[PDB]
Design an enzyme around this catalytic site. Structure first.
Site, PDB file in Angstrom:
ATOM      1  N   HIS A  99       8.896   4.299   6.146  1.00  0.00           N
ATOM      2  CA  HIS A  99       9.816   4.096   7.257  1.00  0.00           C
ATOM      3  C   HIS A  99       9.850   5.335   8.130  1.00  0.00           C
ATOM      4  CE1 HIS A  99      10.530   0.533   5.133  1.00  0.00           C
ATOM      5  NE2 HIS A  99      11.575   0.170   5.851  1.00  0.00           N
ATOM      6  N   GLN A 158       1.705  -1.127   5.206  1.00  0.00           N
ATOM      7  CA  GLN A 158       2.836  -0.985   6.108  1.00  0.00           C
ATOM      8  C   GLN A 158       2.350  -0.202   7.327  1.00  0.00           C
ATOM      9  OE1 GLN A 158       6.052   0.702   3.850  1.00  0.00           O
ATOM     10  NE2 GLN A 158       6.173  -1.098   2.530  1.00  0.00           N
ATOM     11  N   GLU A 211       3.814  -5.760   9.289  1.00  0.00           N
ATOM     12  CA  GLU A 211       3.121  -6.162   8.073  1.00  0.00           C
ATOM     13  C   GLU A 211       1.979  -7.121   8.337  1.00  0.00           C
ATOM     14  OE1 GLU A 211       7.001  -6.432   5.300  1.00  0.00           O
ATOM     15  OE2 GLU A 211       6.857  -7.998   6.841  1.00  0.00           O
ATOM     16  N   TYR A 264       3.031   1.485  10.865  1.00  0.00           N
ATOM     17  CA  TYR A 264       4.046   2.098  11.719  1.00  0.00           C
ATOM     18  C   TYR A 264       3.336   2.589  12.971  1.00  0.00           C
ATOM     19  CZ  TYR A 264       6.531   2.116   7.273  1.00  0.00           C
ATOM     20  OH  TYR A 264       7.148   1.731   6.091  1.00  0.00           O
ATOM     21  N   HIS A 302       4.732   7.352   0.912  1.00  0.00           N
ATOM     22  CA  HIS A 302       3.989   6.623   1.948  1.00  0.00           C
ATOM     23  C   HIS A 302       2.667   7.319   2.290  1.00  0.00           C
ATOM     24  CE1 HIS A 302       7.693   4.386   2.237  1.00  0.00           C
ATOM     25  NE2 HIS A 302       7.583   4.037   3.507  1.00  0.00           N
ATOM     26  N   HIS A 333       1.223   2.710  -0.227  1.00  0.00           N
ATOM     27  CA  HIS A 333       1.754   2.733  -1.589  1.00  0.00           C
ATOM     28  C   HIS A 333       2.031   1.341  -2.145  1.00  0.00           C
ATOM     29  CE1 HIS A 333       5.019   2.572   1.220  1.00  0.00           C
ATOM     30  NE2 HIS A 333       5.784   2.082   0.254  1.00  0.00           N
TER      31      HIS A 333
HETATM   32 CU   LIG Z   1       8.904   2.928   4.522  1.00  0.00          CU
END
Ligand SMILES: [Cu+2]
Ligand SMILES: *[C@@H]1O[C@H](CO)[C@@H](O[C@@H]2O[C@H](CO)[C@@H](O)[C@H](O)[C@H]2NC(C)=O)[C@H](O)[C@H]1NC(C)=O
Length: 223
Positions: A1, A166, A30, A168, A84, A157
């Site tokens: 995050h 994930q 995702e 970002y 992460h 992870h």
């Molecule tokens: Cu996260």
């Protein structure tokens, strides 16, 4: 995050959410087939910004990653959780108007990536432990003018299966000054460039311990 929430150019931070289209929520995208993979988006909400940031071609912009828009420190926990692990990546897209182009579709070319090094340390770890700083060279040889910059960290992870990786990312709005236009990059699309089956998207970073890593997307454009 995490959120790429401001950009530094020539030693000057351009401001929080100024010239970077930021979500307030720091959760990942995702689905690599979603329109949101380009410049973030639903189920997040992304703000607009009327600032277009000037950068001289050949020099670097530094994406400044932070945990949340409210984060005011630069320690590891102020950037992203150290679980992460994954690559950092950056792309450009030539556009007519950097404040209105959505970023969806063809035109992207990769200009930076940092996967895993020969010591086993990941690109996200250098950002996490480097005050959130993700330094990216704007090529000297591209055409001048309006661009989107898509800067990305992929956390792996939970990526043993897909969905799991994930993504970002945020898009900054650039006015590139001084590009020579000597070379026109080959381009890819977002969505399109990544697939759930890619070896750097569906990957166990645990079993076995990972020693080399293939960053998703096209090769880095070079002058
Ligand atoms: Cu996260
Ligand atoms: C400008 O950005 C580039 C990446 O686009 C940086 O180059 C990397 O620098 C790291 C750290 O020294 C090296 O580990 C990589 O091998 C470099 N990559 C390439 C392709 O050269 C560069 O350091 C940045 N420059 C500044 C002044 O921040």
């Amino acid at each position: 995050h995490t959120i790429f929430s401001s950009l530094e150019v020539n030693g000057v931070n351009q401001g929080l959410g100024e010239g970077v289209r930021v979500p307030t929520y720091n959760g990942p995208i995702e689905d690599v087939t979603s329109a949101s993979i380009a410049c973030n988006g639903s189920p997040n909400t992304v703000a607009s910004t009327s600032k277009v940031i000037t950068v001289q071609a050949g020099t670097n912009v530094t994406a400044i990653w932070r945990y949340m828009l409210s984060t005011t420190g630069d320690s590891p926990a102020d950037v992203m959780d150290s679980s992460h692990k994954g690559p950092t990546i950056a792309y450009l897209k030539k556009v007519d108007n950097a404040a209105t182009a959505s970023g969806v579709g063809n035109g992207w070319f990769k200009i930076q990536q940092d996967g895993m090094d020969s010591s086993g340390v990941w690109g996200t770890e250098r950002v996490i432990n480097g005050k959130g700083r993700h330094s990216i060279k704007i090529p000297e040889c591209i055409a001048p003018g309006q661009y989107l910059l898509r800067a990305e960290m992929i956390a792996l992870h939970a990526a043993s299966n897909y969905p799991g990786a994930q993504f970002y990312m945020e898009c900054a709005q650039l006015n590139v000054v001084g590009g020579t236009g000597a070379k026109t990059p080959s381009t890819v699309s977002f969505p399109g460039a990544y697939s759930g089956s890619d070896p750097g998207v569906k990957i166990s970073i645990y079993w076995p311990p990972v020693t080399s890593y293939t960053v998703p997307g096209p090769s880095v454009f070079t002058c």
